[PDB]
Design an enzyme around this catalytic site. Sequence first.
Site, PDB file in Angstrom:
ATOM      1  N   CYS A   1       0.808  -1.237   0.000  1.00  0.00           N
ATOM      2  CA  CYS A   1       0.000   0.000   0.000  1.00  0.00           C
ATOM      3  C   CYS A   1       0.831   1.273   0.000  1.00  0.00           C
ATOM      4  O   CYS A   1       1.639   1.475   0.924  1.00  0.00           O
ATOM      5  CB  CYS A   1      -0.956   0.056   1.202  1.00  0.00           C
ATOM      6  SG  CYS A   1      -1.827   1.696   1.393  1.00  0.00           S
TER       7      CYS A   1
ATOM      8  N   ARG B   1       0.314   4.757   2.876  1.00  0.00           N
ATOM      9  CA  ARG B   1       0.508   4.532   4.314  1.00  0.00           C
ATOM     10  C   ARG B   1       1.003   5.756   5.092  1.00  0.00           C
ATOM     11  O   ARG B   1       1.052   5.737   6.327  1.00  0.00           O
ATOM     12  CB  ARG B   1       1.412   3.316   4.579  1.00  0.00           C
ATOM     13  CG  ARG B   1       0.681   1.977   4.616  1.00  0.00           C
ATOM     14  CD  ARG B   1       1.670   0.854   4.887  1.00  0.00           C
ATOM     15  NE  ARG B   1       2.577   0.649   3.767  1.00  0.00           N
ATOM     16  CZ  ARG B   1       3.653  -0.127   3.808  1.00  0.00           C
ATOM     17  NH1 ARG B   1       3.956  -0.769   4.925  1.00  0.00           N
ATOM     18  NH2 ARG B   1       4.433  -0.254   2.740  1.00  0.00           N
TER      19      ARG B   1
ATOM     20  N   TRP C   1      -8.545   6.654  -0.661  1.00  0.00           N
ATOM     21  CA  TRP C   1      -9.047   7.306  -1.864  1.00  0.00           C
ATOM     22  C   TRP C   1      -8.213   6.812  -3.021  1.00  0.00           C
ATOM     23  O   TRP C   1      -7.311   6.000  -2.828  1.00  0.00           O
ATOM     24  CB  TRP C   1      -9.004   8.838  -1.757  1.00  0.00           C
ATOM     25  CG  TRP C   1      -7.703   9.391  -1.258  1.00  0.00           C
ATOM     26  CD1 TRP C   1      -6.549   9.523  -1.960  1.00  0.00           C
ATOM     27  CD2 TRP C   1      -7.441   9.905   0.051  1.00  0.00           C
ATOM     28  NE1 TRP C   1      -5.567  10.073  -1.163  1.00  0.00           N
ATOM     29  CE2 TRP C   1      -6.097  10.318   0.075  1.00  0.00           C
ATOM     30  CE3 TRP C   1      -8.209  10.040   1.209  1.00  0.00           C
ATOM     31  CZ2 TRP C   1      -5.501  10.870   1.219  1.00  0.00           C
ATOM     32  CZ3 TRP C   1      -7.613  10.589   2.349  1.00  0.00           C
ATOM     33  CH2 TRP C   1      -6.272  10.996   2.342  1.00  0.00           C
TER      34      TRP C   1
ATOM     35  N   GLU D   1      -4.808   4.143 -11.042  1.00  0.00           N
ATOM     36  CA  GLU D   1      -5.619   2.983 -10.718  1.00  0.00           C
ATOM     37  C   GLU D   1      -6.739   2.832 -11.726  1.00  0.00           C
ATOM     38  O   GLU D   1      -7.042   1.732 -12.211  1.00  0.00           O
ATOM     39  CB  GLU D   1      -6.203   3.158  -9.334  1.00  0.00           C
ATOM     40  CG  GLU D   1      -5.282   2.787  -8.188  1.00  0.00           C
ATOM     41  CD  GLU D   1      -6.053   2.569  -6.893  1.00  0.00           C
ATOM     42  OE1 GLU D   1      -6.795   1.555  -6.786  1.00  0.00           O
ATOM     43  OE2 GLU D   1      -5.923   3.420  -5.983  1.00  0.00           O
TER      44      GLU D   1
HETATM   45  C1  HEM Z   1      -4.389   7.839   1.479  1.00  0.00           C
HETATM   46  C2  HEM Z   1      -5.149   6.741   1.437  1.00  0.00           C
HETATM   47  C3  HEM Z   1      -4.763   5.508   0.577  1.00  0.00           C
HETATM   48  C4  HEM Z   1      -4.150   5.469  -0.620  1.00  0.00           C
HETATM   49  C5  HEM Z   1      -3.722   6.686  -1.473  1.00  0.00           C
HETATM   50  C6  HEM Z   1      -4.000   4.076  -0.994  1.00  0.00           C
HETATM   51  C7  HEM Z   1      -3.445   3.574  -2.156  1.00  0.00           C
HETATM   52  C8  HEM Z   1      -3.413   2.230  -2.502  1.00  0.00           C
HETATM   53  C9  HEM Z   1      -3.188   1.685  -3.830  1.00  0.00           C
HETATM   54  C10 HEM Z   1      -2.940   2.512  -5.110  1.00  0.00           C
HETATM   55  C11 HEM Z   1      -3.231   0.349  -3.753  1.00  0.00           C
HETATM   56  C12 HEM Z   1      -3.043  -0.638  -4.920  1.00  0.00           C
HETATM   57  C13 HEM Z   1      -4.384  -0.736  -5.630  1.00  0.00           C
HETATM   58  C14 HEM Z   1      -4.480  -2.054  -6.354  1.00  0.00           C
HETATM   59  O1  HEM Z   1      -3.624  -2.335  -7.238  1.00  0.00           O
HETATM   60  O2  HEM Z   1      -5.415  -2.837  -6.044  1.00  0.00           O
HETATM   61  C15 HEM Z   1      -3.470  -0.024  -2.368  1.00  0.00           C
HETATM   62  C16 HEM Z   1      -3.567  -1.312  -1.886  1.00  0.00           C
HETATM   63  C17 HEM Z   1      -3.774  -1.696  -0.581  1.00  0.00           C
HETATM   64  N1  HEM Z   1      -3.983  -0.813   0.459  1.00  0.00           N
HETATM   65 FE1  HEM Z   1      -3.974   1.338   0.382  1.00  0.00          FE
HETATM   66  N2  HEM Z   1      -4.520   3.300   0.030  1.00  0.00           N
HETATM   67  C18 HEM Z   1      -4.983   4.145   1.006  1.00  0.00           C
HETATM   68  C19 HEM Z   1      -5.578   3.762   2.180  1.00  0.00           C
HETATM   69  C20 HEM Z   1      -5.517   2.506   2.725  1.00  0.00           C
HETATM   70  C21 HEM Z   1      -6.159   2.074   3.946  1.00  0.00           C
HETATM   71  C22 HEM Z   1      -7.028   2.975   4.846  1.00  0.00           C
HETATM   72  C23 HEM Z   1      -5.855   0.778   4.127  1.00  0.00           C
HETATM   73  C24 HEM Z   1      -6.281  -0.141   5.302  1.00  0.00           C
HETATM   74  C25 HEM Z   1      -6.684   0.383   6.462  1.00  0.00           C
HETATM   75  C26 HEM Z   1      -4.994   0.361   3.038  1.00  0.00           C
HETATM   76  C27 HEM Z   1      -4.443  -0.896   2.866  1.00  0.00           C
HETATM   77  C28 HEM Z   1      -4.186  -1.500   1.654  1.00  0.00           C
HETATM   78  C29 HEM Z   1      -4.102  -2.928   1.421  1.00  0.00           C
HETATM   79  C30 HEM Z   1      -4.255  -4.084   2.435  1.00  0.00           C
HETATM   80  C31 HEM Z   1      -3.834  -3.056  -0.066  1.00  0.00           C
HETATM   81  C32 HEM Z   1      -3.669  -4.378  -0.822  1.00  0.00           C
HETATM   82  C33 HEM Z   1      -4.887  -4.552  -1.715  1.00  0.00           C
HETATM   83  C34 HEM Z   1      -4.670  -5.800  -2.505  1.00  0.00           C
HETATM   84  O3  HEM Z   1      -3.761  -6.567  -2.095  1.00  0.00           O
HETATM   85  O4  HEM Z   1      -5.384  -6.026  -3.521  1.00  0.00           O
HETATM   86  N3  HEM Z   1      -4.818   1.443   2.201  1.00  0.00           N
HETATM   87  N4  HEM Z   1      -3.577   1.145  -1.632  1.00  0.00           N
HETATM   88  N   LIG Z   2      -7.323   1.939  -3.031  1.00  0.00           N
END
Ligand code: HEM
Ligand SMILES: [N+]
Lengths: 408, 408
Positions: free
Chosen positions: B107, B110, B279, B284
């Site tokens: 992610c 973070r 968000w 994406e």
């Molecule tokens: C500023 C807020 C956030 C941004 C900009 C962001 C951005 C991203 C992006 C671009 C991905 C990859 C998307 C994909 O290829 O499926 C991702 C995956 C992930 N994010 Fe974040 N995210 C945010 C908030 C969060 C939050 C609040 C959580 C959990 C509390 C989180 C946990 C994860 C996890 C577990 C994945 C893995 C998803 C997967 O394995 O398919 N993120 N995030």
């Molecule tokens: N996301």
Amino acid sequence: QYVRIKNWGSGEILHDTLHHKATSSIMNPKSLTRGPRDKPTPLEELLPHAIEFINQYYGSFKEAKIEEHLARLEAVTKEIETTGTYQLTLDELIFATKMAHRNAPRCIGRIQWSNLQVFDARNCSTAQEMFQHICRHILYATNNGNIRSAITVFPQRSDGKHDFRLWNSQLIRYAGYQMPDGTIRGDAATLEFTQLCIDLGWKPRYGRFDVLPLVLQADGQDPEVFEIPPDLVLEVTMEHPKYEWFQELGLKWYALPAVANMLLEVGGLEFPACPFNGWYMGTEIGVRDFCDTQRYNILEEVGRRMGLETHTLASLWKDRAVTEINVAVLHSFQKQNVTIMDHHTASESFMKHMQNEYRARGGCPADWIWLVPPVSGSITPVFHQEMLNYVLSPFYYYQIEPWKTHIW
Amino acid sequence: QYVRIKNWGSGEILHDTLHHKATSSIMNPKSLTRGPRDKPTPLEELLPHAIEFINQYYGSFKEAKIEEHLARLEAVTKEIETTGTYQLTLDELIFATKMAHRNAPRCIGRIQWSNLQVFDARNCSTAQEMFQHICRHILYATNNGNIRSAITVFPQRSDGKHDFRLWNSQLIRYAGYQMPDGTIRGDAATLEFTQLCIDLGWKPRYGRFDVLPLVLQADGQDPEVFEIPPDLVLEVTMEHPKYEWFQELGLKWYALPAVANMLLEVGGLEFPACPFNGWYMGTEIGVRDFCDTQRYNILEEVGRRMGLETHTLASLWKDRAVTEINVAVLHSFQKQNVTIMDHHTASESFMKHMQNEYRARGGCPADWIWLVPPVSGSITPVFHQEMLNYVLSPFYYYQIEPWKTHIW
Ligand code: HEM
Ligand SMILES: [N+]
Ligand code: HEM
Ligand SMILES: C[C@H](O)[C@H](O)[C@H]1CNc2nc(N)[nH]c(=O)c2N1
Ligand SMILES: C[C@H](O)[C@H](O)[C@H]1CNc2nc(N)[nH]c(=O)c2N1
Ligand SMILES: [N+]
């Protein structure tokens, strides 16, 4: 204890500690390196390895020559028993060099693994004799812009104290100096090495496209410095096909991508000097050499000449400039009849290869991190391809930087 | 034996054999998955895990509350001794949810790990009661385009046969059907799942931006289908800021990226239903959702409207179109006051985070393959950053697809 971790842009290194609390992308892993030594390979290890190799070489024909295979096994054992290592037949060096390329997980061009030219320079003994071979190689591979894939194999390591090897990252390669301005000229990458050529009396021309000298070490002996005959280094001047102001940039790159410092491992043998070459994939020059902060860093200059919102990151102006810089590189090669392939075409090709490989021999070592191009990720097929990264034999290993270990 | 390997573009799977001859990038590794079960966690495993967690929670304040820490340890042991698992305090769920995000190696966002809204729905018992919570969540996080980061935590797994969980990949999400034309409409990705909603009586609207229904399973019971109140799904219509013909494309995407199907693991506990959201980062939508062969695949249509050499791969026309599609997405969000961040800005941010993390607690789990954006690789800082990928606790695990294991 901890784990050293490098950012290659800033040069910043960090020590990871958190991983120790674990449960249940490194550039130079030890796993990918074959280092120096002070003693011949022990026989008990050598022999099994040699046998394995000879069985591969023979198990790779269409219609098996059992008697010669049994014979070769016998002759190889006797040689080891008798001398303390053994020489490959030429018709084995050639296979060695092709399979090892075939086995390089970090290389996109492997579709071509069969077409390799092999220069047997195992009889070399002097520096001047290495530097002659290198010159021959360059001229063959360059072919006046019609790049031929080639490799020059020097004498195998023996005891480890009579190692042949090039101190250069790649054959042809620009210099970089730490000019007074707080700035840096030429190729930032070769900053540390450029100094070393200076320490050995190379005259610094202080420019930004100065070809560095070959620094050759032969039979364990201190490295002598040789200048490259400028007639052999073919270069491509950079012009865009719209933005006539793009030549005002005064850009060029060398046409021959010839990696100079890797070690070949085959049947237990090691050749710590075996320079090879394919040809360029555009992004190499257009994106990494031109656009890396660590490198020539033109990205801002090019953007500015595009009237782009250069101080607003969200403007996406890097996406716009990078693309035109590639267009330029590609266009400049085709113009000037220099062999090149664009990363898109490259990705589709590798894919065909990979498919070929799995039908062929059920697998393909392959390092995703390396096989995906530094722009257009999602847009190429290799991004969506899950792949396994394994080290086979024969294989092309990295090596500890020569000046870190050599005794003068 | 061998190793199954997937290409996610073509859907082609291959079996690697060559790796067996080894010496000395998978989407869903078993290592990243926490699967179902038929029995409560054994106490002998549970207890150590709980203790570890309680010691982390208390070891994470500025000025230590030893007595409460010793007390909590005692109360938790008694509860386990007494009931066969134990409940987290709310002021522990909140920490659990933030640390686990903090610990998600895949992610980029973070930097924001501290700002999370937590909805405690552990008291939920019916489907209708899950679907109410989900609706509340959506509305909070959406905030009329000013996206708030939130998570809704449902009742922890107990015996494994009374699991709460969403069958949806993400909350809001478009459908896709295998229309007669040989083609496919909407979101190819959700092809298999769309069918499943059909099997449970969802009326197919047959379009290309149809929001799919929530498919909710509560307390182990068969999943009931709920339609999402279209008032809650906020969407962004896609217009370019030059190419007025870009709206003729008729494109839109949902504003809330809310991943629905992952499991939280904390102090030995498991919550197989805890939807969360941040968000969007532009790429994406602009690159993966719009440009993946497996997805909406607009790349050719957009290129054609640019008068681009669409049948000459070396033309670099994909590099040109992709970039404008991103420009469009970005521009359409800012227009319409929908929170978004571009991948460049995202990369610089993550970097700050990572630096922060190492000074903070000497490490940062981090998966290069995932943290590098699908366009502009070399051009973002994270490309040049070597990183280690490790699984800590608490953590957000993948799970086996519900319909592969649930008994109706
Ligand atoms: C500023 C807020 C956030 C941004 C900009 C962001 C951005 C991203 C992006 C671009 C991905 C990859 C998307 C994909 O290829 O499926 C991702 C995956 C992930 N994010 Fe974040 N995210 C945010 C908030 C969060 C939050 C609040 C959580 C959990 C509390 C989180 C946990 C994860 C996890 C577990 C994945 C893995 C998803 C997967 O394995 O398919 N993120 N995030
Ligand atoms: N996301
Ligand atoms: C069609 C011809 C070829 C093409 C298009 C090609 C392309 C490439 C590219 C783009 C890289 C990555 C460049 C970098 O980031 O440093 C690479 C690396 C590599 N290639 Fe190839 N190459 C070709 C021929 C060869 C040959 C002839 C060999 C050996 C016989 C080879 C073996 C390797 C190895 C060992 C690496 C790793 C270099 C490193 O680790 O720094 N390739 N190749
Ligand atoms: C930190 C990281 O591994 C590093 O920048 C890697 C990424 N992938 C690469 N891929 C290729 N072909 N060449 C490279 O120099 C790199 N660099
Ligand atoms: C085969 C491969 O691992 C796969 O396509 C990965 C590459 N890196 C990714 N990175 C992110 N953020 N999201 C993804 O779906 C992927 N897909
Ligand atoms: N190369």
